[PDB]
Amino acid sequence: NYNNYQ
């Protein structure tokens, strides 16, 4: 949850 992959 609320993880960012960019």
Side-chain angles (χ1 to χ4, degrees):
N1 293 351
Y2 302 85
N3 299 307
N4 186 63
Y5 310 84
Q6 63 174 62

